[PDB]
Design a protein around this nucleic acid. Structure first.
Lengths: 66, 120, 67
DNA sequence: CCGCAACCACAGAGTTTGGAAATCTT
DNA sequence: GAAGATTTCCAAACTCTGTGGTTGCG
């Protein structure tokens, strides 16, 4: 019977668990998105660092020559 | 998105559609930019004016400044502007002392927003 | 009412609509993880060539600086 | 007369929220 | 197998555009 003390407790127990778990899911979902942007940031920053050094090497080359 | 000069020479802000549907999200994210230097966390508020409507109800009309910009999340226009009339909003930077900026005849708030002409 | 003909039909379409959405979000989420790897790969790749251009310009500067 | 620009309602597709079951994983 | 975690199913409550009925006003 979908309405027998035993079932009822077991039910509520599970609910208690699906709540907790859906929560975890969302949290993990946010972390990701966060992680994303956080990369894109670092990713963009590194691209500069390359540009900076690429030019800097084109200078110590054109410099060794002259 | 693309920005525009305000009544003030110290702050720029997002461009807005000429006419949009009340309580509907906008095509872009409304953001205010300070050319001078402004302390992150500086609260900024937007009010919408009009001859007809003194001040129209808004949603998400407040935002904290950050890195010289106060991006707004789904800012929204509740009150309407009246046929043919546009809203002239008031940006208000909360610093010491509070600073004011204005974008004249900025956006038009109708109950339908732009619609496709009726096929009659 | 819960036995209306309208009811079931409206109800049964909403169900379809839901399947749609659940699928959609579940999908965006994945695409995101993908978008994260994508970039992690790029940071690794970027990081390697960065430590390279640093050794190469620190080496060229070494012959120069110390003669 | 007609079409435009506004209002009001108000369908109908989307979404988010939450309890049941199924499915898994431990 | 047993218990908790995760997923799939749906139902219900709302949110997001659209369209149709009307109306003054050029």
């Amino acid at each position: 019977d979908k309405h027998s003390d035993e079932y009822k407790i077991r039910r509520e127990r599970n609910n208690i668990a699906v709540r907790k778990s859906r929560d975890k899911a969302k949290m993990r979902n946010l972390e990701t998105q966060h992680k994303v942007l956080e990369l894109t940031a670092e990713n963009e920053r590194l691209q500069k660092k390359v540009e900076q050094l690429s030019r800097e090497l084109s200078t110590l080359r054109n410099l060794f020559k002259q | 998105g693309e920005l525009v000069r305000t009544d003030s020479p110290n702050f720029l802000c997002s461009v807005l559609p000429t006419h949009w549907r009340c309580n509907k999200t906008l095509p872009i994210a409304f953001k205010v930019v300070a050319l001078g230097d402004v302390p992150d966390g500086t609260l900024v508020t937007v009010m919408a004016g009009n001859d007809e409507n003194y001040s129209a109800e808004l949603r998400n009309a407040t935002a904290a400044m950050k890195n010289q910009v106060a991006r707004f999340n789904d800012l929204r226009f509740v009150g309407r502007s009246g046929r043919g009339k546009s809203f002239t909003l008031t940006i208000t930077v909360f610093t010491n002392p509070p600073q004011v900026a204005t974008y004249h005849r900025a956006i038009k708030i109708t109950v339908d927003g732009p619609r496709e002409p009726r096929r009659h």
